[PDB]
Design a protein around this ligand. Structure first.
Ligand SMILES: *[C@@H]1O[C@H](CO)[C@@H](O[C@@H]2O[C@H](CO)[C@@H](O)[C@H](O)[C@H]2NC(C)=O)[C@H](O)[C@H]1NC(C)=O
Lengths: 49, 49
């Protein structure tokens, strides 16, 4: 019976272009060789063109 | 008096195929191809769909 203070967060994931992001520093853009990548949380491995 | 020319091979082609055999080759179309060395292809191209 003491009052509690509540916050409720709510968000979508990997749908559209994004605005809120995380504290991560970017790199350059290498092409035509097999690298990992990270585009707004989307991971992967392959060759960019 | 029998004339086996349409089923015996002719030397003008670069293969030993007769006149009925390449009529038979150009009627079995493929739902998917086999090997065209499409491994240099499918990498880095836009017509990979
Ligand atoms: C066997 O049949 C073939 C096809 O009918 C004959 O080939 C023809 O030969 C004449 C030559 O007089 C050419 O004008 C035609 O164009 C040929 N036809 C084709 C489809 O190529 C062949 O001559 C016949 N064999 C014999 C011994 O008569």
């Amino acid at each position: 019976y003491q009052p509690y203070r509540v916050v409720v967060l709510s968000f979508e994931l990997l749908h559209a272009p994004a605005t809120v992001c995380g504290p991560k520093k970017s790199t350059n853009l290498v092409k035509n060789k097999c690298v990992n990548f990270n585009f707004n949380g989307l991971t992967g491995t392959g060759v960019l063109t | 008096g029998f004339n086996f020319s349409q089923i015996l091979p002719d030397p003008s082609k670069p293969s030993k195929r007769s006149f009925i055999e390449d009529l038979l080759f150009n009627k079995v179309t493929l739902a998917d191809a086999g090997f065209i060395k499409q491994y240099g292809d499918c990498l880095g191209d836009i017509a990979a769909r």
